C-alpha cells in the first residue's frame, strides 16, 4: 500500500509513531503534507523550513528514504 496514496493524516500519524517525533505530526498536518508531498521532502526541508531538530529530522528523512525506495 504505497505511501504515494497516503493522506495527510496518515503521514502525520506515522511521524508521531517515531520516537521523539510525537510533537511533530501537527506541523505536517497543517502544511497538508500528504504521502505524495512527503516523498518530495529532504532533511534540510525538515530542519530549515519546519524548524525540527536534527535528531527527529533524521528519523523522518530515513523513513522518507525507505518509503521512496519502495515506490
Amino acid at each position: 500500500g504505497s505511501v504515494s496514496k497516503w493522506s495527510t493524516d496518515e503521514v502525520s500519524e506515522f511521524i508521531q509513531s517515531l520516537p521523539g517525533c510525537e510533537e511533530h505530526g501537527k506541523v505536517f498536518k497543517d502544511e497538508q503534507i500528504d504521502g505524495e508531498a512527503f516523498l518530495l521532502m529532504t532533511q534540510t526541508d525538515i530542519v530549515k523550513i519546519m524548524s525540527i531538530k536534527e535528531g527527529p529530522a533524521e528519523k523522518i528523512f530515513n523513513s522518507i528514504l525507505m518509503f521512496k525506495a519502495a515506490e
Partner: protein, 66 residues
C-alpha cells in the same frame, strides 16, 4: 511557451492544476511565466505564503518541468 505567460496565464494554469488557493500567491506578487519558471525551490517553499505540501508539488511537478 510558458516563458510567455502573463500573470493571468500563471493563475489559470495553477487553478486548472488543482491549486486554486495557491494560485492567488502568483496574482499577489504579479509573477508572470518568465519569473515563475526561474523560481528556485526555496523561493517556492518559503516566499509565497502557501502551505508546504502544495508548495513541494508546485515546484517539483510543475515549475521544474514546465
Amino acid at each position: 511557451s510558458p516563458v510567455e505567460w502573463t500573470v493571468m496565464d500563471v493563475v489559470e494554469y495553477f487553478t486548472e492544476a488543482g491549486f486554486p488557493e495557491q494560485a492567488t500567491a502568483f496574482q499577489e506578487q504579479e509573477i508572470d511565466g518568465k519569473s515563475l519558471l526561474r523560481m528556485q525551490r526555496t523561493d517556492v517553499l518559503t516566499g509565497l505564503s502557501i502551505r508546504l505540501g502544495p508548495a513541494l508539488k508546485i515546484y517539483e511537478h510543475h515549475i521544474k518541468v514546465l
